[PDB]
Amino acid sequence: DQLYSTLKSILQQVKSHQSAWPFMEPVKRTEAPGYYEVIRFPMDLKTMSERLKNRYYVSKKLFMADLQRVFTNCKEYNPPESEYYKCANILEKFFFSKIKEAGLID
Numbered sequence: 001d002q003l004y005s006t007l008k009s010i011l012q013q014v015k016s017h018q019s020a021w022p023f024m025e026p027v028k029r030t031e032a033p034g035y036y037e038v039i040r041f042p043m044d045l046k047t048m049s050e051r052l053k054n055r056y057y058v059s060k061k062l063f064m065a066d067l068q069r070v071f072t073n074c075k076e077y078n079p080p081e082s083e084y085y086k087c088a089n090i091l092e093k094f095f096f097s098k099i100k101e102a103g104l105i106d
């Protein structure tokens with residue numbers, strides 16, 4: 001399947017990015033005590049990798065939703081000038097450039 005191959009490529013490029021490090025695994029409670037009382041829909045790149053493997057991403061829309069959720073969680077939780085927020089905006093720019101380069105559409 002060509003969608004799977006394209007999404008796998010985009011996701012791995014995102015994961016290899018220097019600004020992806022905060023988003024690689026679920027936020028640990030020890031890193032942010034009470035995070036899971038605040039953030040209703042946690043998401044991270046490890047979870048997305050498994051979802052990709054399990055053939056969840058049958059559309060661009062589903063893939064976009066999860067990656068975008070990584071960023072919105074980060075911006076909802078963290079101050080605008082925090083390193084985490086800064087990484088989210090850098091990685092989001094990159095993400096959208098990868099979507100465009102792949103020609104990924106609905």
Ligand SMILES: CNc1cnn(C)c(=O)c1Cl
Binds near residue numbers: 031077
């Ligand atoms: C390691 N990533 C983390 C850690 N703490 N918080 C609050 C975050 O939002 C993220 Cl992405």
